[PDB]
Amino acid sequence: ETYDFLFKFLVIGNAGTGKSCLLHQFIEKKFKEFGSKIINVGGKYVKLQIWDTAGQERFRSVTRSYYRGAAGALLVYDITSRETYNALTNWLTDARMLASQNIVIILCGNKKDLDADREVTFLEASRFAQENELMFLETSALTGENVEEAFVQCARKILNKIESGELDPERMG
Numbered sequence: 001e002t003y004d005f006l007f008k009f010l011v012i013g014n015a016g017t018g019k020s021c022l023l024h025q026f027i028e029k030k031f032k033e034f035g036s037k038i039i040n041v042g043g044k045y046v047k048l049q050i051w052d053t054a055g056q057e058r059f060r061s062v063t064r065s066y067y068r069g070a071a072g073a074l075l076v077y078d079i080t081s082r083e084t085y086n087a088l089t090n091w092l093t094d095a096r097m098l099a100s101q102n103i104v105i106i107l108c109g110n111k112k113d114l115d116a117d118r119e120v121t122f123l124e125a126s127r128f129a130q131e132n133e134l135m136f137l138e139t140s141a142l143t144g145e146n147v148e149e150a151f152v153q154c155a156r157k158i159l160n161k162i163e164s165g166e167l168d169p170e171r172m173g
């Protein structure tokens with residue numbers, strides 16, 4: 001009720017990486033495109049308005065009108081598909097070009113439950129994240145692991161940047 005901020009989030013990344021299932025897990029706490037949820041972050045209630053690009057990756061969603069105004073984005077790859085990890089630089093560039101240069105991004109390496117099929121290590125991706133000014137978590141939309149955490153860390157960093165005067169909360173974000 002007493003929600004104090006409203007942030008537009010994107011969920012972006014290659015087709016097949018689990019973007020739809022991540023949102024269903026976050027909102028409904030089940031495995032299984034728009035969603036909204038209010039979370040409490042350090043005593044502030046934040047409404048998230050989540051634009052999930054599932055099924056619209058090959059080009060429909062990759063536009064100024066869709067990205068515009070997003071304060072945060074979950075950039076999703078699949079730990080079992082190296083190509084989806086190689087595509088991150090493309091998606092990072094998209095997000096910065098089409099939303100803004102200061103969009104807050106969290107890298108999500110999804111399907112961590114598929115340990116036997118892993119093609120991208122945690123350590124390599126963590127190093128990449130550190131190099132590209134990115135938060136990073138591995139997630140499983142299947143089990144729920146780190147799903148809530150991904151949205152919450154993204155929201156917390158946005159609030160931190162509002163506090164630091166790096167982000168204008170009435171601007172894009």
Ligand SMILES: Nc1nc2c(ncn2[C@@H]2O[C@H](COP(=O)(O)OP(=O)(O)O)[C@@H](O)[C@H]2O)c(=O)[nH]1
Pocket residue numbers: 014015016017018019020021022054055110111112113114139140141142143
């Ligand atoms: N085992 C496992 N499978 C997943 C996970 N997330 C998504 N999937 C599967 O990956 C495929 C694509 O997921 P989906 O959410 O439709 O991908 P999208 O195209 O990015 O929306 C489907 O077969 C899902 O069942 C996960 O965390 N673990």
